[PDB]
Amino acid sequence: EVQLVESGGGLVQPGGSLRLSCAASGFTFSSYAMSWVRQAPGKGLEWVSYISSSSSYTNYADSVKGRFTISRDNSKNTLYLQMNSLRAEDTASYYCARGLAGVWGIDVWGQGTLVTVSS
Amino acid sequence: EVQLVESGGGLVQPGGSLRLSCAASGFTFSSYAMSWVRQAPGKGLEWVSYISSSSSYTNYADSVKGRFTISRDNSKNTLYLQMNSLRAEDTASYYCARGLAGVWGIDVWGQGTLVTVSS
Amino acid sequence: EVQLVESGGGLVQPGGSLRLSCAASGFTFSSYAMSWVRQAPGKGLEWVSYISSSSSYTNYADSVKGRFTISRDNSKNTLYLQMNSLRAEDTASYYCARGLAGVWGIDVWGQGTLVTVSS
Amino acid sequence: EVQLVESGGGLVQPGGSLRLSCAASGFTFSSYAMSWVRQAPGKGLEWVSYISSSSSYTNYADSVKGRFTISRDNSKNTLYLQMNSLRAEDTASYYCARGLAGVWGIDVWGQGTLVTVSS
Amino acid sequence: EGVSNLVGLPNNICLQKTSNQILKPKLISYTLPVVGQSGTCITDPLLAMDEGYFAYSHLEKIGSCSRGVSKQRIIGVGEVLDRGDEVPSLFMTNVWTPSNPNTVYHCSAVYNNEFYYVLCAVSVVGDPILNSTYWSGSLMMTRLAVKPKNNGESYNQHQFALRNIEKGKYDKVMPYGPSGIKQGDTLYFPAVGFLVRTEFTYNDSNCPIAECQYSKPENCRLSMGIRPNSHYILRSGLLKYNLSDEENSKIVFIEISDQRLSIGSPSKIYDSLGQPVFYQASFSWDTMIKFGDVQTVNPLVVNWRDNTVISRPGQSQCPRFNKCPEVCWEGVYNDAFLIDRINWISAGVFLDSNQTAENPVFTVFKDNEVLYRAQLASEDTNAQKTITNCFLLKNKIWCISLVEIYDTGDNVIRPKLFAVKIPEQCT
Ligand SMILES: *[C@@H]1O[C@H](CO)[C@@H](O[C@@H]2O[C@H](CO)[C@@H](O[C@@H]3O[C@H](CO[C@H]4O[C@H](CO[C@H]5O[C@H](CO)[C@@H](O)[C@H](O)[C@@H]5O)[C@@H](O)[C@H](O)[C@@H]4O)[C@@H](O)[C@H](O[C@H]4O[C@H](CO)[C@@H](O)[C@H](O)[C@@H]4O)[C@@H]3O)[C@H](O)[C@H]2NC(C)=O)[C@H](O)[C@H]1NC(C)=O
Ligand SMILES: *[C@@H]1O[C@H](CO)[C@@H](O[C@@H]2O[C@H](CO)[C@@H](O[C@@H]3O[C@H](CO[C@H]4O[C@H](CO)[C@@H](O)[C@H](O)[C@@H]4O)[C@@H](O)[C@H](O[C@H]4O[C@H](CO)[C@@H](O)[C@H](O)[C@@H]4O)[C@@H]3O)[C@H](O)[C@H]2NC(C)=O)[C@H](O)[C@H]1NC(C)=O
Ligand SMILES: *[C@@H]1O[C@H](CO)[C@@H](O[C@@H]2O[C@H](CO)[C@@H](O[C@@H]3O[C@H](CO[C@H]4O[C@H](CO[C@H]5O[C@H](CO)[C@@H](O)[C@H](O)[C@@H]5O)[C@@H](O)[C@H](O)[C@@H]4O)[C@@H](O)[C@H](O)[C@@H]3O)[C@H](O)[C@H]2NC(C)=O)[C@H](O)[C@H]1NC(C)=O
Ligand SMILES: *[C@@H]1O[C@H](CO)[C@@H](O[C@@H]2O[C@H](CO)[C@@H](O[C@@H]3O[C@H](CO[C@H]4O[C@H](CO)[C@@H](O)[C@H](O)[C@@H]4O)[C@@H](O)[C@H](O)[C@@H]3O)[C@H](O)[C@H]2NC(C)=O)[C@H](O)[C@H]1NC(C)=O
Ligand SMILES: *[C@@H]1O[C@H](CO)[C@@H](O[C@@H]2O[C@H](CO)[C@@H](O[C@@H]3O[C@H](CO[C@H]4O[C@H](CO)[C@@H](O)[C@H](O)[C@@H]4O)[C@@H](O)[C@H](O)[C@@H]3O)[C@H](O)[C@H]2NC(C)=O)[C@H](O)[C@H]1NC(C)=O
C-alpha cells in the first residue's frame, strides 16, 4: 500500500518564502517521477512542477516558471519545494503524485497540504 | 535612532540547549543582514552565525558549524538562535549587528546578552 | 450594579490581528474614561491603551506605542481594541476599567479575556 | 452548528455589475429557502430577492424588481446574486438567511458582506 | 524486461467459454476529491498506445456535456511503466494545452521513433461534422516527444501546418479516429472524407434489402449522409504522411473499399501480432461490429468479420441488432483490440443494452460467441465512448481500457481507465 505523507504549512505573508515537503514509502524512489499538483476551492487540477528520476529534467508552469524549483533527494525519500515570491493567487492545497498534471494518479491522495497566502 | 534589544540568558549546564533572541526596530527588516557576534572577557570579536535577507545563505564558523542554526523571522522583527550542544568555551556575551564579523558596526551595541556555561 | 462584560479573541498565531471588545451598562458612557489593563501570570498590572470622554486624548505605553490604537463608540456602549502586530510578550488577560493604570477601579472585574499568543 | 459564509465584492462604480455569493453547511440544502437581506447604516432590514427550494418561485422587491435575479445551485451549496444596474441607494451590507424579510432568522449572522457603490 | 506491444509468442490464454469471472478489473485513474463540484463535463477522449508510450486528450465543458463551451484541452503524452509489481500504469511526462480552447476538434495520434504526432483538425465554425458546409479544411499536427530535455525549444513542442492536400474527388479531409499506425518511416491517420451527394456513383440495387422487407431500397443511399436532404456524404479512409521526404507537408486520403460500405465513423487501425488490424464504428444501417485484419494497407482492403453477437446500442429508430437498411445516424463508439491471431481472439469494452447506454461490460469474443465477460461498474452507470488497447507486460498480455463512466461522488462523466489482464488459467 502506497502511503503519501504531505507536509508544510500555510498562513504566510504575501511575498514570503515557504518550503513544502512530501515523503513517501513503498515504491522504489531511486527511479520514478514526482510532481506537485495544487487545486483551489472552485477550480480543478493545476500542476506547478515536475522532475525526472535522475533529476535531469525539471518542468514548471507558465505562472510558476520562476517562483520555485523542484528538487530531489533520492538518498532519503522526500520531495522538497522551496516556494519563493508567492502571491494571493497561490492559495490552494498542494499534492504530490506520480503524474505531471494529467487526470492520472495510481494512489489515493492521503492528506494534502493547504497553503494560505493572505493578509 | 536604531535600537537593538538583546535577550536570552545563560547559567546553563554543559551540553544544554538555550535560545537567544534579539529584536530590532527602525530600519526595514524585510531586506537586510543579521549576524550573531560574541566576545569573551580577554578576547575579541568572534562570529558564529550569519544569514541573508531572503534566508537563502546561512554561514557558520568552524567551531559552531554544527552547534546551532540561525533562522529568520522577517514577519516579526527578531533574531532567534537555537544554541544546542554548547561547551565551556562558549561562555561569552552575544551581540546582534549588521555585519558578519568585520570590525564594522552601524549601531551602538545597546545591552548585549551574556551566556554562562559552567558547573 | 456596574457590569463589565469582557470579550475578544485569543489563541492566535503571533503577528496576527486581534480585536478585543468590552461592553458596559449602568453608568453614563457618553462622558467617562476607559482603559485596557492586562496582567501576565506572575506579573502585575500593565496599562496599554487609554481613551478620553470626547475622544480627544489617546495615551499609550512605551511597549505598545505603535501596536494598537484604542477607539470609542459612545453611541453604543462598547470598548474596542484592534490589536495589531502582537508578540509573545503579549500573552496575558486583558481587562477594562475606569482608570488608566493606577491601583484604582471602582467595579469588580467581571470575567476578563485571556489572550494567548504562542506557537 | 449552522455556519453561513458570505462572500462577493464591493467598491464598484455606479451602474456596475457585482455577483454576491453565500455558501452554507449543515442543514440539508436540497429543500429549504434562501433570501438575501441587506441593511444600510441607520436603517433596518431590507429584503431584495427570494427563491424557493425547487426554484419554482422567485420574488423581488419594488426597488430591485429588475435589478438582479436570484438563482439556486442545489448541487453545490451556495447562493448567488448577479447584482446588475445598481445605484448609490444600494450601498449596504447584504446577508443570507432562511426568511424573506420578517424579523425572523434561525441562525446567527456570521460575517455578512458589505457592498459600496460610490464615486 | 519491458512494456512492449503484441509481438513474438505470448502465453496461452483462455480458449473456452466460462461463466466464472476470471477477469480482475484494476482501476489506475484514482482522482482526487472534487468537493465543491460544478457543472463540468469531460468529453471527446483519446487513448493511443504503442511500444510503451501513451497519449490523452479531453475537452472540459462547463455546463451541458454536449452543447457546452471550451475552457481547456489537455493534450499530453507519456510513458507506460510498472507501478512496482506486475501492474502496469500510464505515467505522463509532457503536457500541452492550446491557447484558444474552442479551436481544436477531432484529434488523431500516431507513434514514431522518439516522438508522438497529434493530428488535430482546425475549425472556426465549431463541430466540423455539424457545420462542414463552411469549414475551411485546415489541419494542424502537433509533435510531442515522449522524453523531454532541458532547454530544447525544438525537441518538446513543434507545430506545422499541412498545406498540400492530394484530395482527388473529396472536397474536405479531417482526421477522424483515435490513432493510426506506422510502416517503417510512414505515418497513417484515420480520417473521413467529405463527398458531394450528387457526385456519388452507387447503383441502388446492391442494397442488402433481401431479408429486410421493412426497408426501402433507397435507404442505403439515404444512410450514407448525416441527413437525407444534406449536402455531403461521409466516406471513411486514411491519411498518409511520409515524414521521410519532408519536402512539403502532404496529405493523401485513400478511401476505404466498397465491401460493407457504411457512413463515416471513427476508424481505428492498429498492429496486432505483425499484421495491421482495422476497426470502424457503426453509425449507420449496420449495427454490428466492423472487425477485420488488413491485407492491402493503402486501399484499406479489409476482410470484414461477420460477428453476430457484438454490436452497439442506439435510439428507437436504429436499435441494437438491426441488420437492415434504415435512415439513421446514431450509435456509440466501442472498439476492441486483437489479442490473438491463430484463433482470432478480440477484447473490448462493449455496452450491453437494447436502446440505452448503460452497464459498461468488458467482454472477450473470438468471432461469434462471448468467452468471458466482466462488469467494470454497476448496471446503472451510463457510458458513451470506450477506447480499448492491449499490450504485453514482459511475459503476458495486458489491456488498459478508457471507459467513460458516471462516478457516484463526482456527478460528472469521468473517463475512468481500468486495467484488465488476459488470464492464462480459467475454469
Ligand atoms: C454554421 O456556419 C455558418 C457560417 O460559418 C453560420 O452562419 C453564420 O452565423 C453568424 C451569426 O452567428 C453570422 O454572423 C453575423 O451575425 C450578426 C449577428 O449580430 C449579433 O447577433 C446577436 C443577436 O444580438 C442582436 O440581435 C438583433 C439582430 O438583428 C440586433 O438588432 C440587436 O441589436 C443585437 O445586436 C448578438 O448576440 C451577437 O453578438 C451579434 O452582435 C449579423 O448581424 C450578421 O449579419 C450580417 O451578414 C449578413 C449576411 O450573412 C448580412 O445580410 C447582414 O446585413 C449583416 O451584414 C451576420 O449574420 C455569419 O455571417 C454567418 N455566416 C454566413 C456565411 O452566413 C451558422 O450560424 C453556423 N451554424 C451553426 C449551427 O453552427
Ligand atoms: C443498376 O441496377 C439496375 C438494377 O439491377 C440495372 O438494371 C437491370 O439490368 C439487368 C441486366 O443485368 C436487367 O435484367 C434483364 O434485362 C433485360 C433487358 O432486356 C434487353 O437487354 C439488352 C439491353 O441490355 C438487349 O440487347 C436485349 O435484346 C433485351 O431487349 C430484360 O429483358 C430481362 O427481363 C427478364 O426479367 C423480367 C423481370 O425483371 C421479366 O419480366 C422478363 O420476362 C425477363 O425474364 C431482365 O430484366 C434488369 O431488368 C434491369 N433492371 C431495371 C430496373 O432496369 C442497371 O443496369 C444497373 N446500372 C448500372 C450502371 O450498373
Ligand atoms: C518516404 O520517403 C522516403 C524518402 O525520404 C522513401 O525512401 C526511398 O525509398 C526508395 C525505394 O524505392 C529508395 O530508392 C532506392 O534507390 C536505390 C538506388 O541506389 C542504387 O541505385 C543503383 C541501382 O539501380 C537501381 O535503380 C533504381 C533507383 O530507384 C531502383 O529502383 C532499381 O531497382 C535499381 O536497384 C546503383 O547502381 C547505385 O550505385 C545505388 O547504390 C535502389 O537500389 C533501391 O532498390 C531503391 O529503389 C530511395 O533511395 C529512398 N530514399 C531515401 C532518402 O532513403 C520512402 O520509400 C517513402 N515511403 C513510402 C513511399 O512509403
Ligand atoms: C474461478 O477461477 C479462479 C481461477 O483463479 C478459481 O480460483 C482458483 O480456485 C481453485 C479451486 O478452489 C484453487 O485451487 C485450490 O486453492 C486452494 C487455496 O489456495 C490457497 O492456499 C493458501 C491457503 O492454504 C493461500 O495462502 C494461497 O494464497 C491460496 O489462495 C489450495 O489449498 C488447493 O490446494 C488448490 O490449489 C486456486 O488456488 C484458485 N486460484 C487462485 C489464484 O487462488 C475460482 O475457484 C473459480 N471459481 C469458480 C466458482 O469456479
Ligand atoms: C432486446 O432486443 C431483443 C432483440 O431485438 C428483443 O428480443 C425480441 O423481442 C421481440 C418482442 O416483441 C420478439 O418479437 C416477436 O416475438 C414474439 C414471440 O412471442 C410469441 O411467439 C409465438 C409466435 O412465434 C407465439 O405463439 C407465442 O404465443 C408468443 O406470443 C412474436 O410476436 C414474433 O415472433 C416476434 O418475433 C423478437 O423475436 C425477439 N428477438 C429475439 C432474437 O429473440 C428483446 O425482447 C429486447 N429486450 C428488451 C428488454 O427490450
Task: Determine contact, residues E69/E408, Cβ cutoff 8 Å.
Answer: no
Cα separation, E29 vs C24, in Å, equals: 61
Contact E368/D at CB under 8 A: no
- Cβ-based burial of E370 (10 A; exposed 0-12, middle 13-18, buried ≥19): middle
Choose the residue to mutate in E200, E205, E218 for probing ligand 2, maximizing ligand atoms within 8 Å of C-beta: E205
Q: C110 C-alpha vs ligand 2 centroid, how far in Å?
A: 114
Q: How far is B34 from chain C (nearest CA, A)?
A: 20
Tell me whether residues D75 and E36 touch, CB distance under 8 A: no
Q: How far is D94 from chain E (nearest CA, A)?
A: 23
3-state per-residue secondary structure call for B45-72:
CEEEEEECCCCCCEEECCCCCCCCCECC
Q: In the beta sheet, which residues pair with residue E172?
A: E194
- What 3-state class would DSSP assign to A21? strand
Which chain E residues are Cβ-neighbours of A43 within 8 angstroms? none
Does the C-beta of E295 come closer than 6 Å to ligand 4? Answer: no
Task: Determine contact, residues D34/D51, Cβ cutoff 8 Å.
Answer: yes
End-to-end CA distance of chain C: 40
DSSP string covering D60-108: E-SSSTTT--B---TTS---EEEEES--GGG-EEEEEESSSSSS--SS-
Task: Determine contact, residues E121/E175, Cβ cutoff 8 Å.
Answer: yes
Q: Which atom of ligand 2 is nearest to the CA of E203?
A: 1
Cα separation, E325 vs E219, in Å, equals: 5
Among chain B residues, the shortest Cα distance to A11 is held by B75
Which chain B residues are Cβ-neighbours of A84 within 8 angstroms? 54
Grid coordinates given for E180 = 493510426
Grid coordinates given for A14 = 504575501
Ligand with smallest separation from the Cα of E24? 4
Q: How far is B75 from chain C (nearest CA, A)?
A: 7
User: Angle at the Cα of E163 (from E161 to E167), degrees rounded to 5?
Assistant: 130
Q: Which of A51, A79, A98, A48 is CA-nearest to residue E29?
A: A98
Element (H, E) at E223: helix E219-223
Grid coordinates given for B30 = 524585510
**What subunits touch chain B, counting only 3 or more CB pairs under 8 A?**
A, C
**Lookup result for grid cell 463526482:** E410
Among chain B residues, the shortest Cα distance to A13 is held by B75
Calculate the dihedral angle through the C-alpha atoms of E181, E183, E185, E187, rounding to the nearest 10 degrees. -30
User: What does the DSSP 8-state code read for residue C61?
Assistant: -
User: What does the DSSP 8-state code read for residue E171?
Assistant: S
Q: B25 C-alpha vs ligand 5 centroid, how far in Å?
A: 92
Q: How far is E368 from chain A (nearest CA, A)?
A: 35
User: What does the DSSP 8-state code read for residue E324?
Assistant: S
For residue E177, give Cα distances in angstroms to E48, E57, E119, E272, E384: 10, 12, 10, 18, 15
Q: Which of E295, E418, E293 is CA-nearest to residue E348?
A: E418
Contact B28/A at CB under 8 A: no
Q: Which residues contact B85 (CB under 8 A, 6 or more apart)?
A: B15, B17, B66, B67
Among chain E residues, the shortest Cα distance to D24 is held by E36
User: Angle at the Cα of C75 (from C69 to C81), degrees rounded to 5?
Assistant: 20
Cα separation, D69 vs E121, in Å, equals: 40
- What 3-state class would DSSP assign to B90? helix
Contact D75/E at CB under 8 A: yes
Q: Do chains D and B touch (3 or more CB pairs under 8 A)?
A: no
Does the C-beta of E247 come closer than 6 Å to ligand 3? Answer: no
Q: Which residues contact A111 (CB under 8 A, 6 or more apart)?
A: A4, A5, A6
**Lookup result for grid cell 520531495:** A79
Cα separation, C26 vs E143, in Å, equals: 81
Cα separation, E287 vs E293, in Å, equals: 19
Cα separation, E162 vs E251, in Å, equals: 7
Grid coordinates given for E313 = 446500442
Beta strands E116-122 and A46-47, pairing class: unpaired
Which chain E residues are Cβ-neighbours of A55 within 8 angstroms? none
- Cβ-based burial of D39 (10 A; exposed 0-12, middle 13-18, buried ≥19): middle
Task: Determine contact, residues C13/C118, Cβ cutoff 8 Å.
Answer: no
Q: Which residues contact B28 (CB under 8 A, 6 or more apart)?
A: none
**Rg (chain C; Cα; Å):** 13
Task: Determine contact, residues E396/E419, Cβ cutoff 8 Å.
Answer: no
Task: Determine contact, residues E348/E336, Cβ cutoff 8 Å.
Answer: yes
Contact A109/E at CB under 8 A: yes
**Rg (chain D; Cα; Å):** 13
Tell me whether residues A13 and B75 touch, CB distance under 8 A: yes
- Estimate to the nearest angstrom the gap between the alpha carbon of E323 and the chain centroid: 22
The closest residue, in CA terms, to atom 64 on ligand 1 is E134
User: What does the DSSP 8-state code read for residue E128?
Assistant: T
Q: In the beta sheet, which residues pair with residue E184?
A: none
Tell me whether residues E76 and A102 touch, CB distance under 8 A: yes
User: What does the DSSP 8-state code read for residue E352?
Assistant: -
The closest residue, in CA terms, to atom 12 on ligand 1 is E125
Grid coordinates given for E312 = 452497439
Length of chain B: 119
Does the C-beta of E37 come closer than 6 Å to ligand 5? Answer: no
Q: Which residues contact E412 (CB under 8 A, 6 or more apart)?
A: E34, E37, E40, E41, E42
